[PDB]
Structure formats: structure tokens, C-alpha cells
Ligand binder design. Structure first.
Ligand SMILES: *[C@@H]1O[C@H](CO)[C@@H](O)[C@H](O)[C@H]1NC(C)=O
Ligand SMILES: *[C@@H]1O[C@H](CO)[C@@H](O)[C@H](O)[C@H]1NC(C)=O
Ligand SMILES: *[C@@H]1O[C@H](CO)[C@@H](O)[C@H](O)[C@H]1NC(C)=O
Ligand SMILES: *[C@@H]1O[C@H](CO)[C@@H](O)[C@H](O)[C@H]1NC(C)=O
Ligand SMILES: *[C@@H]1O[C@H](CO)[C@@H](O)[C@H](O)[C@H]1NC(C)=O
Ligand SMILES: *[C@@H]1O[C@H](CO)[C@@H](O)[C@H](O)[C@H]1NC(C)=O
Lengths: 105, 107, 109, 107, 105, 110
């Protein structure tokens, strides 16, 4: 597990490394813990660089470097908890990283 | 603060400007001189080709939007090129400053 | 050891030459070494496909490109800060071993 | 005749500006004074691919023909690399000196 | 109306900037003041970088950076006058810039 | 003819520059010359697919690779031994023929 803390009201940047060759062709998803799915990368894998949003949560993927980037805009106290980066393939979903987010003031 | 770059006259000077790639996602960049900030060069009008080097006179510019770095080349640097400049990020008709740069020329 | 020094807040370019024939076909890595035979932690490596070594790979604020014809490995430390100073290794990968191409001290002015 | 100073064991970049319209369509070369100037590297035989890096030994050359900048890279600079060199613009069978360069190796 | 001044018997380089995306696909012309056409860029717009000559006048176009370059080789007093850079579209021609060429001994 | 000397037991690198435009599309070969314009015993040649000329090709402890853009052929003699010494040709191949790019004397030192 990894912990990311950010000041309230600002953007928090969560980085998620993976093996770019192992997960080649797979979309990624950001979910919160069951595991409520928040956002996934674009349906067209060659457009994984595209920033996609759910509310004030953005996801973007560098598939050459193997870096998945989740952005949390306007970090509120409610946004603390436990989340997962996952790699989707068919119906299954391997966890890439489990992430705990903290807020400060 | 304002970064200082030093180059020898008659040689090429590479000025770099880091920025946050998420904050400025999708935004073109520009390079201008202070006299007001007079525009010198901007990156490609199509953001997905920001890596393509654009020239204006002896100044070139390229953008690496994934790494979050803007690179400006001052070709054949001359003492009259010394002065104050700005890396900017454009959206709508506003120009957010990313870095103030001071260019010094030597012997 | 070779010393590279740069101004803080500006990009620093580090180049490691190597024998292109001895390390033909090998991927490269840049790593940070904290002990004479210390952990030596991976920072960034070249493309998983060796014929695409020339493509810039980013990890964080570090970029790597390899010129396998000239035998020159180029590392870019973007926005150099004091915490970047220290000892690093250019390494050539084969199997699960890494051979040292060059030891590099990064100093920050 | 400009002086380019480089640290030994590191790659030294020599940059060489030229009038891009007066040398249009022309190949460029790097040579070392010995005395006659002996040819080291030249740019791509096809002028429209001059941007493509060409190596001879520990010397590389690339040409940006739009901006009018020629770049030479001395790889792994050694003490025996110091000396006088020349950027040349080729046309027919004559070579015009674009820039005389003194290379200085430090330590 | 910008002024360009060049010593007689030597090359004068006249540069006209323009908006590259606005003029995408359009060829350019150099005209002398009606407006008598002197030289225009290549018929194949993807070869606009090609230097075209009319006598001692040459024209070349950088469609990526949006810079048109006119060269008056071996400038002579009878080349002084008022000129125009133009963008050709369909059958019309829009003035990019008006250029005053001046010569010195 | 130029001499390339190496110490016995270590890799020796031979270089053959050539006019990359003149020899565009031609494979290259390293062969041992045993007579006055006579037998050229072929040792190793670059890849049969010319766009793959960068590929390292082996015969025993001898390797060849070709930089067709810069115009440089590289022969590697790994673990140089006395039986490697001799007169060699760098060749440019076309049809059934061969143009001599360079003549090389390989010498071994203990
Ligand atoms: C956005 O996140 C909420 C939070 O659970 C979820 O209910 C909703 O379905 C998401 N939107 C989309 C389009 O998936
Ligand atoms: C180049 O500079 C001129 C004036 O300095 C300006 O009119 C032109 O639009 C510029 N071009 C670019 C691509 O910035
Ligand atoms: C980037 O760094 C992280 C740890 O900081 C590591 O997990 C990942 O493998 C690295 N990426 C590459 C391509 O080396
Ligand atoms: C490289 O330079 C050397 C002189 O230092 C020369 O003999 C050789 O021919 C050059 N290479 C090419 C491909 O011309
Ligand atoms: C340019 O060419 C046109 C016809 O293409 C001709 O009428 C004109 O005289 C020429 N101008 C010069 C300066 O040669
Ligand atoms: C290796 O070279 C010898 C001559 O030295 C030759 O007879 C043999 O056929 C070569 N083998 C291959 C696989 O090319």
C-alpha cells in the first residue's frame, strides 16, 4: 500500500507505475473501496493519453512509460479513504496499486 | 523567482522551462521578450504536434507535454539578445506566466 | 567516476558512452546508488523493445534516451534540485544482471 | 574562430550557424586541421534528410536546414581531441568554411 | 507597411510572417506595385519549401512556422519600390503584408 | 592495406568506411584472401535482408554489423587468436560479383 497526502482545496496527483509490456493493450480504472469504479481510461486504447473525467476526478495513462496518472481536483475531506488502480482485461481486473489518500489543513 | 541562463556569444543557448503537465494539459505555449511582453514564438497550433520544432528568426521552440518541459533555442546568441523573457501557457486570450528568464551573454 | 554539474531549476543532461558492440541488444537503466555495494535503486530504463531505444521514456522528472549506433546513453534530469545530487549508475541489462557502464556524480550549483 | 570548451569523458556539442538561404540545398562537413583539413563527418547525402544523425567514430553530425544550424557532437571527449576544426559547406567540389572552431578539453 | 533596406549588389532577405493554420493549403505570391505578380510558391503546396526564381528574385515558404521568405539577389536601385506578400485562395489574393524595399550604395 | 593489431585473448574491432550512397542496397562480406587475386574464403556476410543490415551476424567467433546510413562496416573478432591473423577483404556484394571496400591485415600480439 502507498499513501498520498494533499492540502485541502488543491489538486492531488496520484501516480501509478506498471510494466508497460505486461499490460499492453489493457485499459485502466480508478476505483474506491467492494470497489466502486470512478473512472477508466478511454475505450480506444491508442487514445489512453486522453484525460477522462468523473466529476473532479481525472485519469490519464502513459502507456509507453507505464505510468497511470489520477488527478483529484479540489481535494475535500470526504476524498480520504482507500482506492485502487486496476488494469482491466475482459471481466477481470488486476490491482496495480492500492492507494490511501489523506487530506491536510 | 526568475531563472538565469548564460550563454557564449556566437553559440546556441538552450533555455528550458518546467511546468505541471496536468495543470496545463491541452495548452499551447509561447516565448516572449519584455520591452509589455512581445511574443517571439509559440508552439504548434495543434497541441498533439507540440513536439514539432517551430522557428521564428533565430529562436526555436519545442514542447514535451508528457514530461512537462518547454525548450527554447536561441540560435547564434548575441549581446542584444540579453534581457528578460517569459515562458507562458495560453488559454482563451490569457497568458499565464510559467517562468521568468534572464538571458546573459558572455565572451 | 565522472562529474556532471548543473544549475538548480534547469534541466541537466547526462551522457554515458559505451561500447556498442559489447552491449549490442541490451536495454539500459539509470539508477541511484546508496552504498559501496548498496541497494542501487532503479530510476528509469530504456524501452522494453530494444529497436525502440531512441524513444524518450519518462519516469517522474527523469528521461532516458539511448543511441545504440553511436553507443551513447542520454539521461535528462528535468528541473534539477539539490535532492537530485549524489551518485548514480548507467547500467546495461541482460538476464537479471546489470553491468555498470559508468558511475556519475550529480552536483547542483 | 570560436572556442568550444568541453569536459573530458563527456560529449561536447559544437553548434555552427549559417545563412540558410545562401547555403540552400548544400551538404555540410566537419573536418580536422592537421596543414590540410581532413574530412571527419558529413551530413546525409540526401539534403532533405540532413536532420538525420550520422556518425563516424566518436563524432556525429546533424543539420537543421530551416533554422540554419549545424550541430557536431564529439562523444566521450578525450585530451587528444583538442585542436583546430572546420565546419564546411560543400558545393560541387569546393568547400566553403562556415566556422573555424578551436576545441578545448579540460579534465 | 514595413521597410526593408539592403546594400546594392548584395542579397536582401524579406520576411513576411503569417498565421500558419489560417493559411493552411494556400500558396503565396510576391507582387510589385495595380499589383504585378513577380513570383509565387510551388504549385504543389506540400513543396512550398522549394525555392522558386523569377530572374534574381526567389521565394520560399515555411508553412509550419508561418514565415514567407523573399530573396532579392544582387539588389539594384531599380528594384526599390512598393511590394506585397499575398495569399492565393481560389482566384483571389489577400495581402499578407505591404513591404517597402529601399537600396543604399 | 592497413594493419589492425590486437592482443591475443581480447576482442579486435575492424572498421571499413564506405560511400553509403554508392553502396546503397548492397550486402557486405568479410573474407580471407589466400592468394594473389585468388581464393577469397568467405567468412561472414551481412544479413540477407538489407534493411536488417544492422543485425549482428556470426561465424564462430567472428561478427559483422553494418551501419548503412553512416557508411561503416564493423567486423568483431572475439577472443583473437593466431589462426585469425592474415589478409582480409571487406567486400560490397552485387549479383555474383564483389567490389573490394578495404584490404585489412589482422595481426596478433601476445
Ligand atoms: C462517476 O462516479 C460515480 C461515483 O460512484 C458513479 O456512481 C458514476 O456511475 C460514475 N460515472 C460514470 C459515467 O461511470
Ligand atoms: C514571428 O514573429 C513575428 C514578429 O516578431 C510575428 O508577427 C509572427 O507571428 C511570429 N511567428 C510565430 C510563429 O510566432
Ligand atoms: C519508475 O519508478 C517506479 C518506482 O519509483 C518503478 O516502480 C517503475 O518500474 C519505474 N519505471 C521504469 C520504466 O523503470
Ligand atoms: C572518419 O574519419 C577518419 C579520419 O579521422 C577517416 O579516415 C574516415 O574515412 C572517416 N569515415 C568516413 C566514413 O569517411
Ligand atoms: C516575373 O515573371 C512574370 C511572368 O511569370 C513576368 O511577367 C515578369 O516580368 C517577371 N518579373 C521579373 C522581375 O523578372
Ligand atoms: C565460416 O568461415 C569458414 C571459413 O573461414 C567457412 O568455410 C564456413 O562456411 C563459415 N561458416 C558460416 C556459417 O558462414
Amino acid at each position: 500500500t502507498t499513501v498520498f497526502q494533499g492540502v485541502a482545496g488543491q489538486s492531488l496527483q496520484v501516480s501509478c507505475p506498471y510494466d508497460s509490456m505486461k499490460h499492453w493493450g489493457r485499459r485502466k480504472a480508478w476505483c474506491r473501496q467492494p470497489c466502486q469504479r470512478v473512472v477508466s481510461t478511454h475505450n480506444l486504447w491508442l487514445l489512453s493519453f486522453l484525460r477522462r473525467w468523473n466529476g473532479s476526478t481525472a485519469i490519464t495513462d502513459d502507456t509507453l512509460g507505464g505510468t497511470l496518472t489520477i488527478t483529484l481536483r479540489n481535494l475535500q475531506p470526504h476524498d480520504a479513504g482507500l482506492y485502487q488502480c486496476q488494469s482491466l482485461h475482459g471481466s477481470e481486473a488486476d490491482t496495480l496499486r492500492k492507494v490511501l489518500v489523506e487530506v491536510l489543513a
